[PDB]
Write a protein that binds this ligand. Structure first.
Ligand SMILES: N#Cc1ccc(OCCCN2CCC([C@@](N)(c3ccccc3)C3CCCC3)CC2)cc1
Length: 469
């Protein structure tokens, strides 16, 4: 409307007043996405973008929020004439969804830095005519809710967003761009991407949000960063409290990434009486296993990151091996570059740094060292095996000689007497089975006291020949 009942908590004078508003909306039949996004974007603007004059909390007066809300709903209702797009069965048409998408797109500034912070919310859309890629998808869903189109929902993979709609919520439509320089497929289905088994579309095991999950998304989308060195404590607390609210109401049940986000917040500043970060990372993984066929990568990356920051090398390696065990059953496609970057950084920067420190600490006489644990060597091998298996049958390759130099270095961090204790068994303490042909052929090389660097490089890159002189 806004409806009279939506107005009664205003003004919002504190973090807890914002939480109250969210609790009230979440108790309603259809929480108002437009209201909630505007409120979050307003408070984020005045806590992270411009803190001038801040003394405690940027008071959100009804007149201010109602005027932004009226700006949004006038823009959408004025531009989308529903009479041109008749709705059979309380469900929307592809042409209507494309029209809403066009309205949002055409409203945006012609040129801006697309990966700025703080351009995720409808506050950014209205005040700066700027949205990020997923922010466009969210805005389309909000616009559709404003129009009364109850069937249009947000769909999320781990790196992209689109919408579902239509009979049984079975249709898909692209509504935003992905990446940089990829020509957009706005208006089309996601079926080609599902069919090619790319990570971008998760083999169809992507999130189909309900209205509560869309609230969770906008909460995850809060960006407390003020600058490279500085987060808003007020926004961290708000996001954390809102995520707990959502958790308590059941709305994180099917949202792995949100559980990882909450775990990270709890690591930073734990809430008394709440589960530990580790419990929450494991709940994220459980969510992915239960609802998404264990086809998500980030539940395991979140866990690995926590173990890495806490120098639990064994457990970090195990979680990265688990990441690779998920990726192995995908085809590496155009538009999957973000996950390639994640794996590249782990293999070629993070793991080497962790193992270098471990080596120094072993020299200093550490006991229980990951470098003396054959199960840790097995996790490292399983990580590479999943990456190599991922590469098999993909339309673009993954491995190259850059990766091989780091593999050889990482292998060398383990003494031969440790490496010799892993039992590599064939289909048909530690025991490991390799799924990739690359690692099966490398087995022979993985225990020599002196790693044959040149042979390992040849096997990992499948390089046919060596230099002529
Ligand atoms: N080791 C390790 C490691 C740990 C965590 C890690 O990434 C955790 C952050 C994952 N990232 C995924 C995309 C995600 C997001 N960019 C996203 C999520 C789904 C669909 C599109 C975009 C946002 C979610 C709320 C606003 C947009 C932001 C969080 C990477 C490596």
């Amino acid at each position: 409307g806004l409806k009279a009942a939506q107005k009664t908590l205003f003004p919002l004078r504190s973090i807890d007043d914002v939480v109250r508003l969210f609790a009230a909306e979440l108790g309603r039949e259809e929480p108002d996405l437009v209201l909630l996004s505007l409120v979050l974007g307003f408070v984020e603007h005045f806590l992270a973008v411009n803190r001038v004059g801040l003394t405690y909390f940027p008071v959100a007066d009804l007149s201010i929020i109602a005027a932004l809300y009226a700006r949004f709903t006038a823009q959408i209702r004025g531009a989308v004439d529903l009479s041109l797009y008749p709705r059979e069965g309380g469900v929307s048409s592809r042409e209507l969804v494309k029209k809403v998408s066009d309205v949002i797109w055409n409203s945006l500034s012609r040129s801006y830095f697309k990966d700025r912070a703080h351009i995720q919310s409808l506050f950014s859309f209205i005040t700066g005519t700027k949205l990020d890629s997923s922010g466009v998808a969210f805005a389309v869903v909000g616009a559709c809710q404003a129009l009364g189109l109850r069937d249009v929902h947000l769909a999320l993979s781990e790196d992209h967003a689109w919408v579902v709609f239509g009979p049984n919520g079975e249709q898909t439509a692209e509504v935003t761009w992905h990446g940089k320089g990829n020509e957009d497929r706005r208006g089309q289905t996601v079926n080609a991407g599902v069919a090619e088994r790319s990570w971008l579309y998760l083999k169809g095991s992507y999130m189909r949000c309900d209205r509560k999950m869309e609230v969770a998304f906008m909460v995850c989308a809060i960006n407390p960063s003020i600058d490279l060195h500085t987060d808003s404590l007020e926004l961290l607390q708000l996001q954390q409290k809102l995520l707990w609210l959502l958790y308590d109401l059941g709305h994180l049940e099917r949202y792995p990434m949100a559980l990882g986000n909450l775990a990270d917040l709890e690591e930073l500043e734990p809430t008394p009486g709440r589960p530990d970060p580790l419990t929450l990372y494991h709940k994220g993984i459980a969510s992915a296993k239960t609802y998404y066929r264990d086809e998500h990568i980030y539940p395991y990356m979140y866990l690995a990151g926590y173990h890495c920051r806490n120098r639990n090398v064994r457990e970090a390696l195990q979680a990265w091996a688990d990441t690779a065990t998920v990726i192995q059953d995908y085809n590496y496609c155009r538009e999957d570059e973000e996950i390639y970057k994640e794996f590249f950084e782990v293999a070629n920067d993070v793991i080497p740094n962790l193992l270098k420190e471990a080596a120094s600490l072993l020299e200093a006489g550490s006991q229980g060292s990951a470098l003396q644990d054959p199960e840790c060597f097995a996790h490292l091998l399983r990580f590479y095996d999943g990456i190599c298996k991922w590469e098999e049958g993909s339309p673009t390759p993954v491995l190259h000689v850059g990766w091989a130099t780091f593999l050889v270095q990482s292998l060398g961090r383990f003494e031969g007497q440790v490496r010799q204790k892993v039992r590599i068994v064939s289909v048909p303490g530690p025991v490991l089975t390799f799924q990739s042909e690359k690692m099966k052929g490398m087995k022979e090389l993985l225990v020599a006291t002196k790693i044959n660097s040149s042979a390992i490089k040849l096997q990992l890159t499948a390089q046919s020949q060596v230099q002529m002189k």
